[PDB]
Design a protein around this ligand. Structure first.
Ligand code: CA
Ligand code: CA
Ligand code: CA
Ligand code: CA
Ligand code: CA
Ligand code: CA
Ligand code: CA
Ligand code: CA
Ligand code: CA
Ligand code: CA
Ligand code: ZN
Lengths: 206, 206, 206, 206, 206
């Protein structure tokens, strides 16, 4: 349990061996979640990259937030993908929150505190809770099989996860700053293991 | 009967089966009206879609607010249409207010609190009081004959209707969300029925 | 003799029969004038139109403010024309003031409270006192001979006229909504006759 | 000497006969100077024009501030020219200050209170003190030989000249019109002669 | 040892002979550093130029901050270059800070107080302490071999340097004007030699 407040993980160049493994108190399967995080990369007009990679022993893409060049954000749950298209890239750090709810299939995707349209994905599914949660690489197997062509080059931080859907008022707090207590991954009480070329530095964003 | 304040209807996937039917205490046929609503969709550069479908047994397009692909807003009263061309799509929630007065034929169309020029439509006509008012689908018959290629995919809310023409000052109060009470459809006391895949969630816009 | 404060004339369709004639209490030969007004039309990228038409029995274009397609504002006194070119159309209400002085020939043209450069027109000329002053149409004879393809379609209001050139401070006050006292035509004590399809409605601009 | 505060000279049409001669109480040659002024013209895309023409018996362009069509501002000392190119023309009144110091050759050119990069011209030169200073026309001889295709059509005023280089703090005050006391030409104590069609009117700029 | 507060160096013309050489008693090789400065030039869309050139006998580009036309900022440590692409030039003074740490190889580049992505250069290297630190020219040997085609034309000032990586809050303090004390180069106690056409003038930036 380490407090990572105001610090981010830095992956300064492309590799297939640099990653952070985040440990969640494994539990019953999830019927809903929210994941929020900050990241900052120049890779967006060049190639695609994984932002957050959650795999189970039986599904490598159990939850995957990904940037796909010439498209925009890619969001996948239990192997099924949906797109949130982005016509202009930002040259600045980005905050995202994304959520999924089994009962409705609704996915929300929030970029710098502003919502995309609601979309539909994997209504009725359950997300497994024996997970391998990885920052900086895209998993093709449980805890492994990374591709350098999907590695994250740049900074990522403030990764928090909850097992329910945050309301728009709660998102606004996470984006602007205020008190909250994530119950799956908490940045202020983070259990993690680093591997390869990854550094811990003061965050570049407010 | 339900205060829908801060909530919206969500239509997360294309279909011809998902809709909301709004119930008005309607008695007197209409010689004037104002409709205002907020909606959020990414469909605008892909296809046309219906925003507000008001149908009677004599005229399926008695009041129709529609987005026409590569044209802009389409406004229909008693089967006759007028266009408000839009050169550039805004991809963000939009507030619209539209009004018609039979005496002059004057139509107004307001987008995010800004007026379009006044136009003329159906001077002398009377709009039927026995109506089916639908969100999410376009009616080709009283309460039905929907076409999936005209469904709204996204969120709609703050739907309000009056049986007279709001003044520019009153429109501004609606847009900034000051106190009002509509006399045909009131979002703060709405009676409605839901069909198919539609959800009620906290509104995405402020 | 009517206070038109906060109201505008609406000309919702193309025609050669809808117009307003304004009556000055006057008849003194003009050695100078200023004309101010607000108007709102969506015609500007499609065709030309008359904005303010002042005719005497000797000269149909005695004072003429006109929009000419692909050029911009055309301003004529005593049948002689000067242009104030406009590269990009504003699709929003516009406020204009224009003035002329016989002694110097100096013309000013102010758009949304901002001055165009001073130009020269008809130095030494006298503008006739007995006039037909028309809104909505362009006159080719005293009080008539209108051309439908040059009709104003949209709203016009706040029309005022003085028999001297307003200073830049005075125009700034008129634009910003301060106090002023027109001595030829006064929108707050307006004597007029309407013909054809013209309506009086709350103004759309603040 | 008259106080011309709040007034500007107006040259309403092209000519080669309209100009204003400004009288400086000059004696000792100049080893530095600053000239500031406001001007407003719409000529900038169709031809060049003189802004401030200072001539000596031995040199017609002893100091010349000129607008070169398709280039931007042209600044000359003792017949040697430097350019401050302008990619996009502003169609609004402009305030300029420009300075030159013989000890360094450094030229400054400020446009609407913002400094261009410093440049180099005529280091060690001395500027003649028996001068003909004209507005409205470009001198090819001491007090004459004007070219109509180089005449200023528009307004000019707030013309002030010191025999030293103003500091950045002082320019900011001259742009803000805080207090200042020029020692060569003082718009508040101006001695001048007019010729041809030039008018004095209240300034268009605030 | 001069207090340069509120002054800048001015290089008014392109040459290969105008430069400033900054002196300080550095003894310890550098395992980290930060440099900050203001500069202002109009060269950016015409050609490349050197902003801060730090050479050792071993390496002419030991630390080099450089502008490359049609590309952006170039940052070099020990002859190894990284780019920070800039597609739209800022035609105004700019403040930059740049830092490197040997332990991680992480480089930071901040423009007008906002950070670029973190990149990687020369992990494990050491920057030599016996240096030639030049403004105004780019070094191809220890203290010389200047190329006029890489000369800086414009102003530079507020040059400071430290032997450690400034944190984000420390950069804020510098950019926003708070008191600070640098430990390698200090604008308030600057020792230097100058050759050629270089002037000291009041700074053009705040
Ligand atoms: Ca995978
Ligand atoms: Ca993969
Ligand atoms: Ca229909
Ligand atoms: Ca249909
Ligand atoms: Ca005509
Ligand atoms: Ca006519
Ligand atoms: Ca000359
Ligand atoms: Ca000449
Ligand atoms: Ca070199
Ligand atoms: Ca070189
Ligand atoms: Zn944040």
């Amino acid at each position: 349990q380490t407090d990572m407040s105001r610090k981010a993980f830095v992956f300064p160049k492309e590799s297939d061996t640099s990653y952070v493994s985040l440990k969640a108190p494994l539990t019953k399967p999830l019927k809903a979640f929210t994941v929020c995080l900050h990241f900052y990369t120049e890779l967006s007009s060049t190639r695609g990259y994984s932002i957050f990679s959650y795999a189970t022993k039986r599904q490598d893409n159990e939850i995957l937030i990904f940037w796909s060049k010439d498209i925009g954000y890619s969001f996948t749950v239990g192997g099924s993908e949906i797109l949130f298209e982005v016509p202009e890239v930002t040259v600045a750090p980005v905050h995202i929150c994304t959520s999924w709810e089994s009962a409705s299939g609704i996915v929300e995707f929030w970029v710098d505190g502003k919502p995309r349209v609601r979309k539909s994905l994997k209504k009725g599914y359950t997300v497994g809770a024996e997970a391998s949660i990885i920052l900086g690489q895209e998993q093709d197997s449980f805890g492994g099989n990374f591709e350098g062509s999907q590695s994250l080059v740049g900074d990522i931080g403030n990764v928090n996860m909850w097992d329910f859907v945050l309301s728009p008022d709660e998102i606004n707090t996470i984006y602007l700053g205020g008190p909250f207590s994530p119950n799956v991954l908490n940045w202020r009480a983070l259990k993690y293991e680093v591997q390869g070329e990854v550094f811990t530095k003061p965050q570049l964003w407010p």
